[PDB]
Write a protein that binds this ligand. Sequence first.
Ligand SMILES: C[S@@+](CC[C@H](N)C(=O)[O-])C[C@H]1O[C@@H](n2cnc3c(N)ncnc32)[C@H](O)[C@@H]1O
Lengths: 34, 261, 126, 238
Amino acid sequence: TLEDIENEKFTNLEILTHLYNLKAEIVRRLAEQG
Amino acid sequence: TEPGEDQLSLLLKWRSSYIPPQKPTNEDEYKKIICKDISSEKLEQHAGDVSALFINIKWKLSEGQSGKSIEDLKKLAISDKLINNGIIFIWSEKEILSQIVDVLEAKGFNYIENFMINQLSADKALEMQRKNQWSDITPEQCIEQEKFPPNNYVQDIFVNSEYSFFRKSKKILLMLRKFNKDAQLELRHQRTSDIFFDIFEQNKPNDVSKKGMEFVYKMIETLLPKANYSEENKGAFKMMELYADDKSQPRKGWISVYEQE
Amino acid sequence: LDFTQYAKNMRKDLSNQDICLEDGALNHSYFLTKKGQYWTPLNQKALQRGIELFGVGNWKEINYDEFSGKANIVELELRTCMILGINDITEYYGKKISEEEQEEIKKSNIAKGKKENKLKDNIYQK
Amino acid sequence: SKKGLQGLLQDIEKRILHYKQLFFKEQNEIANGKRSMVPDNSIPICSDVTKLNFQALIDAQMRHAGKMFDVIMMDPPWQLSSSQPSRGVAIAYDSLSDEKIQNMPIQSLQQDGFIFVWAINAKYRVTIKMIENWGYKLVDEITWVKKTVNGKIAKGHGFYLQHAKESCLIGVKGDVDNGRFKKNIASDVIFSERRGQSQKPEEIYQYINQLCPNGNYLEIFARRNNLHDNWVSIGNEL
DNA sequence: CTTAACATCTTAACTTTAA
DNA sequence: TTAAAGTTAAGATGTTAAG
Ligand SMILES: C[S@@+](CC[C@H](N)C(=O)[O-])C[C@H]1O[C@@H](n2cnc3c(N)ncnc32)[C@H](O)[C@@H]1O
């Protein structure tokens, strides 16, 4: 999801690499769809 | 505060739950084993196989202390005609803690848990209340009643001791287990926290109130469920207290050892 | 005896390199990050020399000659973003730039940021 | 649902732009000279105490202040439930045996002063034995009562009783009767909140500084939470 | 000897619900 | 919205089977 990595207990770099891995997940999903 | 709910009254809500029972008069549940001197009294002769030992001993902190020193603990006798599977509940201090536990482990009992009482001075409560502002009241009737001063910061209220180190506000009771073979101990534990705040008196902190001693007694009673009265403690009770007084000690299911003068 | 010079002497003697500074002062930049995720000046110089040593864009071979540890790719890209001064790295692929011209176009990027009149925390956007 | 994850990806781009700007601002104020909560006089050391070279610490402390440590604090990593207790408290750090804690030299680090060892219920006798064989003599006990966010006793699970306390034992080493080490100070009971995992209250440092003002302090098994002023602090994750 | 699994608890924060 | 209960996660527990 998107709201599970937005925690106030999470430091900014950890959040940001979570969103980067999440972009990797969307990129692979679009590769699968195409 | 306004509805009579502060930090003090939030921690002193147990006091209205516990009420001292009347003196038993059955001649079936109180054992009078009064002798001249316990150190001069031969133990394990009338009692037997108890599972909760209470030693209400006033410790000799220094020369001027009017109590019993640890040499009276050295002369104590505990054998197999005495507490065998049970637990000792003994008052302990900080100066003689190492010697107390070391001499108790020379008899078989080893430490298990702690249970202390946070002293809150009633005199400090009324003095802080009258400084913030409830007069003509000594803390004795404050002990006997529930009319306690309001206090939202309770760390100021503690008793002022006279230690030559960190000041003393502590009434730690030491619990010591006597593990034995081929006999499981029936316990009903986790029913009471190790800390409860209790109100004490200024310049006289070496005693717990009637309700506090009731709290300790009921703690022991719910801790070991088979040592209280279930249709079988006829004479041979499974709980005994040493030293005692004519204040709270004669109990249904409790052997009381006195100290003749 | 004061405790300031005392503290500097203790830190200069037995404290770690990432905790004390060169004169013994406290490295405060290390104590507001996590443990092991601090960006050391040695790591900074390693990234600066590895930009020229190997190719740019792909950071796998950059991480090969890096400290081989807490050197995740995303943080390397995100700090090179401020090293060179822009967020668009994908359009700068295949460009090997040394430290002098890195400072040159960093100054140029900050300058064009202050001309475009929407500069945000000394970083030019694209 | 192509549009669904496409819109998710656009939201991802917006959030990453937001966080990139957030961390860029953080790095810019780091380079600008932002100061942390750690006081400027703290002396942190980050190494395993099993592998630490206490000779260097002894030499430096002797050669700088002209005196040794006058207070040692200790929060040993006792052996409890590791990461999934399944009924009670997790203890989210490594545990040290009693032999390993006993091995390290403490009697060399002091000649006159106090020690502060925080014991748990299972390791009360063990702590007494440690500080009795190190040369110290058991003198005092400091207990931390844990209150909760609205100001009542915070009870935690136990075996015989519910546990709502924490124990610290204090043994002196040598001469105390000097200008330092003021007597009849503070209280043995610290009534304070539960501000973290095994995080002792900040009032213990206030009581220590009341015990001996502007002294030479050592503290093994440290985290960034305290890192106090004029304190030498050894830790693993410092 | 060490890890994993046992009850025999209390309290605050989050979630759902009738008003 | 609102306060009023259900539900859940957190607390530096001691003892015992299983290799
Ligand atoms: C009890 S915790 C510290 C708690 C701290 N006193 C507080 O007030 O929160 C023990 C700490 O000692 C450190 N430590 C653990 N194992 C260690 C080891 N083997 N050697 C050195 N330090 C260690 C870790 O930093 C760990 O967090």
